[PDB]
């Protein structure tokens, strides 16, 4: 076992509160989970900036961010790097391993509290897993996907699944024919 | 709180579990390692004999050959005893039962499995409704938490396992405009 902030309560799993400094539009801004209340939030942890592994998901979320906003959804990516490294990464061209200009916030988890709360921190290596969390408009966790490679299709799947959760939120559910409660 | 979901290396191994299941109406011992080499869809649901239809389990059972064809198995688990699971299977669907079913029902009577999986609710004494997809190497790939029975979660699960498997086989390529730095 280890400790984490992912505690089942009631009949749901509330997303743990977080706050920290993010880079938005090239500037530092304090961000918190509660800033996204009333919207779905895709919260994407990735190991580190400036590695030799392409940031496929962040680039694709950035490219498609207007599609998510169109369905009441925001996207925030997070790693244990400082906000100064996030800014430098954005300010480095993609042809040189950088992220380049990006339209989603990069949140800093420098003191590791957020990733420990989300249960994705690796104690030995000092960074997180690659993990995509979908949080609904009530702040409840709906899905976590863990990939060890950068997977571009996970952006498509995220758009599809958010829309599916929202459809379910609104329409409820129907039982199979032939089953009746006792 | 405490759970078994511990990141290790560069991923999240699915916590070991073992317990007694009902399989084709018989009690059998089952454990996570029995599924090595196969994807495992491990579905927790709160309780047998409730007034909430068991839509997922019914659909997984009807479609189980589609999962088996892609080297995937499905196990459902609640905190109920194996005796309760067998009685539930033996109760007709039109009376709130599960009826005959082609997927194992795992008992987590002492709550060890659901605590290890981080889905146990201490106050009520049962689990959340949650679907875990575990790959052929025993690594956790996805967790989905639905409070309502969602039938399409079966179709989605099939599609996601297929996608995870496609990635396993083919790997991924970088966006065209991106190149790494180097030492």
UniProtKB/Swiss-Prot annotation, chain B:
Query: Mostly located where?
Result: cytoplasm
Q: Which UniProt keywords apply?
A: Antioxidant, Cytoplasm, Disulfide bond, Endoplasmic reticulum, Oxidoreductase, Peroxidase, Redox-active center, Signal
Q: Which reaction does it catalyse?
A: a hydroperoxide + [thioredoxin]-dithiol = an alcohol + [thioredoxin]-disulfide + H2O
Q: Name one GO biological process term.
A: protein maturation
Record keyword NAD present: no
Q: How is it modified after translation?
A: The enzyme can be inactivated by further oxidation of the cysteine sulfenic acid (C(P)-SOH) to sulphinic acid (C(P)-SO2H) and sulphonic acid (C(P)-SO3H) instead of its condensation to a disulfide bond.
Q: Which residues form the Thioredoxin domain?
A: 13-166
Instruction: Name the source's superkingdom.
Output: Eukaryota
Answer whether the UniProt record assigns the keyword RNA-binding to this protein: no
Whom does it interact with, and what assembly results?
Homodimer; disulfide-linked, upon oxidation. 5 homodimers assemble to form a ring-like decamer.
Q: What is this protein called?
A: Peroxiredoxin-4
Which gene produces this protein? Prdx4
Which part of the full protein is shown? Answer: 87 to 257 of 274
């Amino acid at each position: 076992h280890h400790s984490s902030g992912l505690v089942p309560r009631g009949s749901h799993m509330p997303a743990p509160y977080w706050e920290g400094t993010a880079v938005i539009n090239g500037e530092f801004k304090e961000l918190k989970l509660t800033d996204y209340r009333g919207k779905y939030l895709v919260f994407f942890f990735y190991p580190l900036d400036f590695t030799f592994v392409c940031p496929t998901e962040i680039i694709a979320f950035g490219d498609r961010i207007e599609e998510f906003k169109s369905i009441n959804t925001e996207v925030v990516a997070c790693s244990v790097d400082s906000q100064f490294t996030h800014l430098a990464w954005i300010n480095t061209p993609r042809r040189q391993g950088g992220l380049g200009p990006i339209r989603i916030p990069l949140l800093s988890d420098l003191n590791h509290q957020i990733s420990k709360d989300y249960g994705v921190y690796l104690e030995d290596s000092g960074h997180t897993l690659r993990g995509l969390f979908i949080i609904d408009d009530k702040g409840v966790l709906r899905q976590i996907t863990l990939n060890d490679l950068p997977v571009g299709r996970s952006v498509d799947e995220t758009l599809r699944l958010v829309q599916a959760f929202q459809y379910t939120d609104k329409h409820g559910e129907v039982c199979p024919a032939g089953w009746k409660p006792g």
